[PDB]
Ligand binder design. Structure first.
Ligand SMILES: CC(C)(COP(=O)(O)OP(=O)(O)OC[C@H]1O[C@@H](n2cnc3c(N)ncnc32)[C@H](O)[C@@H]1OP(=O)(O)O)[C@@H](O)C(=O)NCCC(=O)NCCS
Ligand SMILES: CC(C)(COP(=O)(O)OP(=O)(O)OC[C@H]1O[C@@H](n2cnc3c(N)ncnc32)[C@H](O)[C@@H]1OP(=O)(O)O)[C@@H](O)C(=O)NCCC(=O)NCCS
Ligand SMILES: CC(C)(COP(=O)(O)OP(=O)(O)OC[C@H]1O[C@@H](n2cnc3c(N)ncnc32)[C@H](O)[C@@H]1OP(=O)(O)O)[C@@H](O)C(=O)NCCC(=O)NCCS
Ligand SMILES: CC(C)(COP(=O)(O)OP(=O)(O)OC[C@H]1O[C@@H](n2cnc3c(N)ncnc32)[C@H](O)[C@@H]1OP(=O)(O)O)[C@@H](O)C(=O)NCCC(=O)NCCS
Ligand SMILES: [Cl-]
Ligand SMILES: [Cl-]
Lengths: 389, 387, 387, 386
């Protein structure tokens, strides 16, 4: 069975406590569900299921994937669920939605991810009761999203471990970070993000604001980048500049069979050729994309040289340089419009976010074979091969 | 692509703030992952992926499904993820794990659910800052698990709406609840839950928990003396409604040809599954179209079923599903239901799948069905056939 | 037993979450204690006791009055304690310190008040444990400072009761608030706040705060366009009511004979004081019997007063006090009031005492009076005479 | 300038999360305000002001002293305010109420203290907002009542320094605690606390309970405890005071006022004193405070017939007794805070009740009450009957 991506859309990536500071994730997810339906000419009443990845849904209510589907007009007869594979959630949900059609259980699937790291609350177990002494209010964003559960340190420390084995210097990681900021700024100026971004209306206060530009894209320098202090180790190289940030946003895609798209006259954004997920050492979780991409290319019958465009998520400059050095693909075809260092990193949605950038760049330049991949906390990776029609 | 369930296991369903009061969900899930591996003769190094449903993972850390797999001995080369479809999470994860092997992406899958409603913390968004005035510390169990996000009332109110449309009286719902408590107690005394339950060691003295803590029985005189917990003039009480519980349940999945090569005798063959949505006001009706679509995909009729496990979230919704589908009530929840056993949201789907599989084996039933109602107006069902 | 005020000082009144957003109250109190010692030529080693009023000391540690005295250089041999009479705390502490010397128990007293409404935390009793459901994190500023403990509503509702009984229209309360804003705005430019305000160094960079941050410019047209903040059909708005503020204020007290030996010329002599209770429903009427009894103890008439400082908690309450005593409104709050300057509850009593004392010196006034209304239905007043 | 105490009363000292677990402090204060009025035959309408010490009033509402007076029947014409001198709050409020009548500003004063350490909440400053990272929920009982603001450690560590410099051994503190525990049980069994304790009606969901007995009153079971503040320390949970709830107050008027009303007073306030000491050794506070009180009264240590020295810690209590040299057989003859309890806001007035009612039954002429104060302070007051 051949499954294609009929359409795709994403919101602008908002800053931490920025444009989407008081916007729940399902509200961002509802906008993207409506957009992928409008861009493909498919009504909300035709959706069988909505599958949205989300890592931090605490305090948002019962099944935020169902809340986003309801507000987008998807009828009550359909189903909706969320899933959590950390940073690979947004891309895995696309593969999960693909399998719904491959097994014959659904026809039209809206798959992607949504995340509101700004709305992540502080929690504390209080049922037993704190009779005496102080107790900690746990940040769910740090605890459930950014801290390794086996070794106890942040995901930035894992980038320090990757920097040690590959011997990646501070100046090399800053050169990668500056390159990402300059490619993302150039892509924003030329309007290459307009096709994939759907505007979001932030209701509240006294005026309604339309958000249609990635809020982190502002540019940077090499003199101001090397003056930053390391945020994870006193003698480390990972700083706040060469590492991805905390962001809000959503991204999704409309899935259907290749024969179904031909019957509707739809021109798909690409054909899902294969996907893969593999685990690695949690100490070097940034290496996830290395075996995940290899297995994805092996299942597709492709070689590394056959790829025309690559979207490798830039969780950290240290891990991103390590993946490129091992796979050896042409770095000029990897993240041609910037990466998460400049655009942002909403964990649950980034998987579908970089899939949107991959699909719309493959369309404008005429690329035939593409690949998207991300590293996953806890020692995992996920990749997917896309081919045009 | 024929997918079988080689083995299955579950922990005892613990009471709210009971035996598993301070036990994280992944610790319960790790025991069940190790159990389904031992009962099938499959090593942890052969597992491709672990898929665990969970609704309330707040405060437990990065990806509790990966934490349960790692502690169970599953190597780092494998993958693991969690999913949330509320009450149908435990059963959907089995269907999701089945699709991993059906599409050729994996060979060995551990799929199920785990939930620790006792460890659910209180949360509050404090990044923007509370300029002035009081703010509420939100119970994540109530908000993210038991409160409808569209109408704002508890899941017990949705059972009241089902009771109005089907005209189910207070005494009729209590008779269903008392029958559920007495069937579960008889099954516990006769030892029918021992095959499916794997013991759990509560570290701290070490205590071995191998009996469902909610299974104690009840009467009709003490059941009709309870006050309604959701409406002053309502019929749903704490006795005829499911409780708050902790536990885990999973199963080992592989192809039918893979089981034949390993000499494993599977617990059953996954014939079909289905999930459908309904109105959030009457979410308990989910099992009605979900089971029908599941039977249609399997090519079966309601009369063809030999055993049925329909989760008892509420006596009102459970009576409505049986009255609508019309299946023989003597083959439905023969060993009791969630009213007596308990209702761990993330694990209940796989919990009742364990009860179905091990009862189909002891009595020799050939065609079975498991179904649950889902908050927000959904249902999920799966058809199992023996080999 | 003649007790005089040798010197006095206060910090600038900061806005809510403004310059003193992250500054504890005892840090503000230390500056005013050191300032009143420096302005009188009295060493810290001569202080017997420090009495600082404070309403919201939660989370600041053991006895913030002791923290402010020690940080101001007062040696450990001295004593320090805090007291809470709500809005009259700052002025009552001055009267309490006066009684310490009158009874022969002390010689040198630093008395005043301090309040940090921005540093007021949210609290919740959690020892028993929250089994299930949401619980409120109580804002101690609202509960312990701005909410009546007997009727449950804000102090603005009590101002509505006074406004209804006196038949005060919105435009009449609107005209008094604008007059208060215009007198305070003129005082900031004319430098009348320079003598009483001591700069405070906010220890991102050190910032010197020496101007009242709440002092804003208003008119009569933009003032009537505001919405009522306490009742949909009310008259009290955010413009005609006092604001939320931080600050500190204190004074150095000693006997008249003690000042003559040290060459200190006091700002005034404490002639009498009084405190009386009223109905909590109309707590704004407190200053009316408190000032009259204070005048009775002093042997003075209303016409004998040259300057009056009546705290402006609300425009409704402030107009009611002026109408009853009948004193010349041109000698009442000549430099503005709490509506424009601000209202740090614990410090407001000593705050308006600084404005009174330094104004009697600048214009040559002989007889002065300072009074405030107190939540829960009380009032406090003090009569000051020059030398 | 003679001020007498016409009557006095107190509630039973409750255990931490015990009988008064869900009882606000002003409710305990209301009972004692009504009790001192009934025992003296004085109407609530004659009270000028109520002065109640309290250390932990967070979450209780505007001015709990005003809340306690209003429910106790004191009319709105009176005034009420609270004050905080930590452990000396309850006794200082009596001295503050004495000064109100001495200066001619009031005639009838109800002065004492109240504390509900069980109802003390956890707090956290959240107006600025926690952008990132975990933050601590601060226990207001520990931080605002039991933690030194200058050195950052618990009040029990200050007792270790008093034990270190005075060289008080582990066995020395246990002998003082057992003597304190045995005297309090003997006084409770003999009914020696019945005159001073007023019952409190605890209303609740399942039943109303009448609390009129000290719940904390209870070497082999005593010497098996571990030190609670230092691994190499001497202060344990047995030889240190606990966390308690309760209230205590007194009715104040002039000696001529008591003679005119036919009231026979419990005693005359002769003098008082407050002095500061080193915060590191706050337990030494009562030593110069008692001497200064006796000097102003013209008395010597040998003239005292009864002494009430607060037992915050066995180490600090032993140091005061050894230096002042008063007869230990007349000090806390009915037990101390180690066995009875230590409600911070109420403890000052709590030990004043025990002194007044013991001086009356045994015929003592001159008595003394004193307590140590956190942050390096002390307070003492001399009372003599007529
Ligand atoms: C590293 C991290 C803690 C940053 O902390 P932060 O709160 O966001 O603080 P900022 O990002 O605003 O950076 C702070 C400083 O660096 C400067 N800075 C940041 N990025 C810069 C850039 N790209 N160029 C130049 N200067 C920069 C900022 O201006 C600021 O200066 P300041 O101190 O005067 O305010 C946070 O981004 C993080 O946790 N990243 C990791 C996310 C993650 O692990 N995701 C999962 C990966 S698998
Ligand atoms: C019903 C519910 C509100 C109960 O909350 P609760 O406050 O803990 O009520 P309790 O568990 O304390 O039980 C109440 C009383 O009924 C009695 N009781 C309970 N079950 C009984 C039974 N089966 N037989 C006889 N008496 C019983 C209990 O002993 C208790 O007595 P008590 O008054 O001394 O406490 C809660 O379990 C709930 O919300 N369940 C629904 C969850 C849900 O929605 N599930 C479906 C998801 S779609
Ligand atoms: C009344 C009160 C609730 C105001 O709360 P607030 O919302 O923070 O008031 P704000 O200043 O932030 O907003 C008031 C509005 O009116 C305007 N406004 C307020 N004061 C003004 C003034 N003095 N002149 C002109 N315009 C003014 C503001 O610009 C604002 O408009 P906006 O919302 O569009 O920005 C608060 O000041 C209060 O609690 N007062 C009573 C305190 C008290 O009880 N003290 C004890 C008395 S015994
Ligand atoms: C002394 C203090 C530190 C001990 O608190 P605690 O450690 O929580 O003691 P607990 O509440 O747990 O009492 C229960 C325990 O003590 C044991 N215990 C208590 N009292 C006992 C007694 N009288 N005899 C024997 N055993 C006793 C119990 O068996 C139980 O055992 P555990 O220690 O293993 O838990 C505490 O009461 C305190 O902080 N007091 C403050 C005193 C103070 O500073 N006052 C102000 C000075 S100016
Ligand atoms: Cl293995
Ligand atoms: Cl297989």
């Amino acid at each position: 069975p051949s499954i294609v991506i009929a359409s795709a859309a994403r919101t602008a990536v908002g800053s931490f406590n920025g444009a989407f500071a008081n916007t729940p994730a399902h509200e961002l997810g509802a906008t993207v569900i409506s957009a992928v339906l409008e861009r493909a000419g498919v009504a909300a009443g035709e959706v069988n299921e909505v599958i949205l990845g989300q890592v931090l849904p605490a305090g948002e209510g019962q099944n935020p994937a169902r809340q986003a589907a309801m507000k987008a007009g998807v009828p009550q007869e359909a189903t909706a669920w969320g899933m959590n594979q950390l940073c690979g959630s947004g891309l895995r949900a696309v593969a999960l939605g693909m399998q719904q059609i491959a097994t014959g259980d659904a026809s039209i699937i809206v798959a992607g991810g949504m995340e509101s790291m700004s709305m992540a609350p502080h929690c504390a177990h209080l049922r037993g009761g704190v009779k005496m002494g102080d107790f900690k209010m746990i940040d769910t964003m740090i605890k459930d999203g950014l801290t390794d559960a086996f070794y106890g340190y942040h995901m930035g420390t894992t980038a320090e471990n990757v920097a040690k084995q590959w011997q990646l210097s501070r100046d090399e990681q800053d050169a990668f970070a500056v390159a990402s900021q300059n490619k993302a700024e150039a892509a924003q100026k030329d309007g290459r993000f307009k096709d994939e971004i759907v505007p979001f209306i932030v209701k509240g206060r006294k005026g309604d604001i339309t958000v249609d530009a990635d809020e982190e894209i502002r540019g940077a320098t090499l003199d101001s980048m090397a003056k930053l202090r390391p945020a994870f180790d006193k003698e480390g190289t990972v700083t706040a500049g060469n590492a991805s940030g905390l962001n809000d946003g959503a991204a999704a895609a409309l899935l259907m069979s290749e024969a179904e798209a031909s019957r509707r006259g739809i021109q798909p954004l690409g054909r899902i050729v294969s996907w893969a997920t593999v685990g690695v050492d949690p100490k070097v979780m940034g290496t996830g994309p290395i075996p995940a991409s290899r297995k994805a290319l092996e299942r597709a019958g492709w070689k590394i040289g056959d790829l025309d465009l690559v979207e490798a998520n830039e969780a950290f400059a240290a891990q991103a340089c390590a993946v490129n050095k091992d796979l050896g693909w042409d770095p000029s075809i990897v993240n041609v419009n910037g990466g998460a260092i400049a655009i942002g990193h909403p964990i649950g949605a980034s998987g579908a976010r970089i899939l949107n950038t991959l699909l719309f760049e493959m369309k404008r330049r005429g690329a035939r074979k593409g690949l998207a991949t991300l590293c996953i906390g806890g020692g995992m990776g996920v990749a997917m091969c896309i081919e045009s029609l």
